[PDB]
Design an enzyme around this catalytic site. Structure first.
Site, PDB file in Angstrom:
ATOM      1  CG  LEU A  22      -1.967  -1.073   1.271  1.00 26.51           C
ATOM      2  CD1 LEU A  22      -2.603  -1.096   2.654  1.00 26.51           C
ATOM      3  CD2 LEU A  22      -3.020  -0.842   0.197  1.00 26.51           C
ATOM      4  N   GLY A  23       2.063   1.189   0.485  1.00 28.50           N
ATOM      5  CA  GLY A  23       2.954   2.327   0.458  1.00 28.50           C
ATOM      6  C   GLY A  23       4.351   1.848   0.746  1.00 28.50           C
ATOM      7  N   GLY A  25       8.645   3.402   1.287  1.00 30.13           N
ATOM      8  CA  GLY A  25       9.564   4.523   1.369  1.00 30.13           C
ATOM      9  C   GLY A  25      11.001   4.077   1.172  1.00 30.13           C
ATOM     10  CB  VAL A  28       1.997   0.536   4.647  1.00 30.91           C
ATOM     11  CG1 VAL A  28       0.584   0.124   5.064  1.00 30.91           C
ATOM     12  CG2 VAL A  28       2.650   1.521   5.652  1.00 30.91           C
ATOM     13  CE  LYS A  50       3.620   3.397   8.639  1.00 32.05           C
ATOM     14  NZ  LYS A  50       3.707   4.898   8.935  1.00 32.05           N
ATOM     15  CG  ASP A 159       0.342  17.205   5.162  1.00 31.17           C
ATOM     16  OD1 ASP A 159      -0.194  18.248   4.698  1.00 31.17           O
ATOM     17  OD2 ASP A 159       0.843  16.330   4.419  1.00 31.17           O
ATOM     18  CG  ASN A 164      -2.474  12.848   4.948  1.00 29.67           C
ATOM     19  OD1 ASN A 164      -2.002  11.768   4.561  1.00 29.67           O
ATOM     20  ND2 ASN A 164      -1.766  14.016   4.940  1.00 29.67           N
TER      21      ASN A 164
HETATM   22  C1  LIG Z   1      -8.273  -1.981   3.182  1.00 28.73           C
HETATM   23  C2  LIG Z   1      -8.024  -2.422   1.726  1.00 28.73           C
HETATM   24  C3  LIG Z   1      -7.157  -1.465   0.860  1.00 28.73           C
HETATM   25  O1  LIG Z   1      -6.409  -1.948   0.027  1.00 28.73           O
HETATM   26  N1  LIG Z   1      -7.278  -0.146   1.094  1.00 28.73           N
HETATM   27  C4  LIG Z   1      -6.643   0.817   0.380  1.00 28.73           C
HETATM   28  C5  LIG Z   1      -6.340   0.704  -0.977  1.00 28.73           C
HETATM   29  C6  LIG Z   1      -5.732   1.780  -1.639  1.00 28.73           C
HETATM   30  C7  LIG Z   1      -5.471   2.952  -0.958  1.00 28.73           C
HETATM   31  C8  LIG Z   1      -5.772   3.100   0.397  1.00 28.73           C
HETATM   32  C9  LIG Z   1      -5.495   4.354   1.031  1.00 28.73           C
HETATM   33  C10 LIG Z   1      -6.363   2.000   1.059  1.00 28.73           C
HETATM   34  N2  LIG Z   1      -6.723   2.043   2.372  1.00 28.73           N
HETATM   35  C11 LIG Z   1      -5.848   2.162   3.408  1.00 28.73           C
HETATM   36  C12 LIG Z   1      -4.464   2.454   3.335  1.00 28.73           C
HETATM   37  C13 LIG Z   1      -3.673   2.599   4.476  1.00 28.73           C
HETATM   38  C14 LIG Z   1      -2.307   2.986   4.441  1.00 28.73           C
HETATM   39  C15 LIG Z   1      -1.715   3.179   3.198  1.00 28.73           C
HETATM   40  C16 LIG Z   1      -0.391   3.612   3.106  1.00 28.73           C
HETATM   41  C17 LIG Z   1       0.315   3.882   4.267  1.00 28.73           C
HETATM   42  N3  LIG Z   1      -0.292   3.717   5.525  1.00 28.73           N
HETATM   43  C18 LIG Z   1      -1.558   3.291   5.600  1.00 28.73           C
HETATM   44  N4  LIG Z   1      -2.124   3.112   6.819  1.00 28.73           N
HETATM   45  C19 LIG Z   1      -1.633   3.540   8.015  1.00 28.73           C
HETATM   46  C20 LIG Z   1      -0.678   2.867   8.761  1.00 28.73           C
HETATM   47 CL1  LIG Z   1       0.007   1.417   8.136  1.00 28.73          CL
HETATM   48  C21 LIG Z   1      -0.276   3.293  10.047  1.00 28.73           C
HETATM   49  O2  LIG Z   1       0.701   2.508  10.628  1.00 28.73           O
HETATM   50  C22 LIG Z   1       1.115   2.895  11.949  1.00 28.73           C
HETATM   51  C23 LIG Z   1      -0.851   4.401  10.643  1.00 28.73           C
HETATM   52  C24 LIG Z   1      -1.804   5.038   9.889  1.00 28.73           C
HETATM   53  O3  LIG Z   1      -2.472   6.141  10.332  1.00 28.73           O
HETATM   54  C25 LIG Z   1      -2.787   6.126  11.726  1.00 28.73           C
HETATM   55  C26 LIG Z   1      -2.192   4.624   8.624  1.00 28.73           C
HETATM   56 CL2  LIG Z   1      -3.381   5.523   7.768  1.00 28.73          CL
HETATM   57  N5  LIG Z   1      -4.266   2.453   5.657  1.00 28.73           N
HETATM   58  C27 LIG Z   1      -5.627   2.160   5.754  1.00 28.73           C
HETATM   59  N6  LIG Z   1      -6.400   2.034   4.616  1.00 28.73           N
END
Ligand SMILES: */C=C\C(=O)Nc1cccc(C)c1Nc1cc(-c2cccnc2Nc2c(Cl)c(OC)cc(OC)c2Cl)ncn1
Length: 298
Positions: A22-23, A25, A28, A50, A159, A164
């Site tokens: 999902l991300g 650097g 994630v 993460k 941010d 976000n």
């Molecule tokens: C749930 C299925 C899915 O694939 N969802 C998806 C697809 C494409 C794009 C997005 C945004 C999503 N939904 C997400 C994505 C993320 C996410 C993406 C990239 C980086 N971080 C995160 N989540 C994340 C994490 Cl891992 C942490 O780790 C400590 C803390 C966060 O904020 C408190 C977040 Cl947002 N997350 C959820 N849905």
């Protein structure tokens, strides 16, 4: 590792099946988790995980530990991305959070813009796009409630932006990355992201010019986000490069009223961009003002 065990949050890593990134650097990944609810030990759920990458320094580990611990402290709210569990023992550090199925709010809005006016013949609901005014107001209300909760936990986001805010399967707004380290003393103000974003365009003037952040700096950013909602994911200060943005902010320039936007909502935007932080609404006031708009829906 020798990380301390916190039984309140520890989750067995073999109950995770890691999948699509999902991300990246650290990184994630999307994952399936089994038994996140111990009352339903064989039930699957989709989560975001993460983790560090092989390159990671001791400082990167400390940063992820800090992010994990701040999420434990801030506690749970319906309109934030919540911590679900951690894997700290016998293997790499994983931090497991809620996964929002519909992606981020900017892309959600842009994908639901009505098509251009001469693309296809008219039909039964051709005058209706997917997004209605009360649902746009509800998105704004939900973000304001999430920010009010985070403020009550002494969390300044720094941010806040539609990118976000994540959207669940049920169209619930969840604030993302509220405890992420942002390196505020080394921001490249000219930075453009891979997707074309200029994050400086969401910074309150006291943050940009004076490196001062308060909850009222986040209220400024919320005003920018309100403008993104009511342009269905538009880019702020269209056609203004960063060099000119600096000059325009020193002159008190503000964005124009978007099309199809009632004066109640542009009014709230302009209050959020009042020069003096004390003359911007609080999040408590924004929640109340948006609630009154929602209750006035026919
Ligand atoms: C749930 C299925 C899915 O694939 N969802 C998806 C697809 C494409 C794009 C997005 C945004 C999503 N939904 C997400 C994505 C993320 C996410 C993406 C990239 C980086 N971080 C995160 N989540 C994340 C994490 Cl891992 C942490 O780790 C400590 C803390 C966060 O904020 C408190 C977040 Cl947002 N997350 C959820 N849905």
């Amino acid at each position: 590792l020798d990380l301390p065990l916190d039984p309140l949050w520890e989750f067995p890593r073999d109950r995770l099946v890691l999948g699509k990134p999902l991300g990246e650097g650290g990184q994630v990944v999307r994952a399936e988790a089994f038994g996140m609810d111990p009352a339903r030990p064989d039930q699957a759920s989709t989560v975001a995980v993460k983790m560090l990458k092989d390159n990671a320094s001791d400082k990167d580990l400390a940063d992820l530990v800090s992010e994990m611990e701040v999420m434990k402290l801030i506690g749970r709210h319906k309109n934030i991305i919540n911590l679900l569990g951690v894997c700290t023992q016998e293997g790499p550090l994983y931090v497991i959070v809620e996964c929002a199925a519909k992606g981020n709010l900017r892309e959600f809005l842009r994908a639901r813009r009505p098509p251009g006016p001469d693309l296809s013949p008219d039909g039964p609901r051709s005058s209706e796009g997917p997004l209605s005014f009360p649902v746009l107001v509800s998105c704004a209300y939900q973000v304001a409630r999430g920010m009010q909760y985070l403020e009550s936990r002494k969390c300044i986001h720094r941010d806040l932006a539609a990118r976000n805010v994540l959207v669940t399967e049920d169209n619930v707004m969840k604030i993302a990355d509220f405890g992420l380290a942002r390196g505020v003393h080394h921001i490249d103000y000219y930075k453009k992201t891979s997707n074309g974003r200029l994050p400086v365009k969401w910074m309150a003037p006291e943050a940009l010019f004076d490196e001062v952040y308060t909850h009222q700096s986040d209220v400024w950013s919320f005003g920018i986000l309100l403008w993104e909602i009511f342009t269905l994911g538009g880019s702020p200060y269209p056609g203004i490069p960063v060099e000119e943005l600096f000059s325009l902010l020193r002159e008190g320039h503000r964005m124009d009223r978007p099309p199809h936007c009632p004066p109640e909502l542009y009014g709230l935007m302009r209050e959020c961009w009042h020069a003096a932080p004390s003359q911007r609404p609080t999040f408590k006031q924004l929640v109340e003002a948006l609630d009154k708009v929602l209750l006035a829906v026919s």
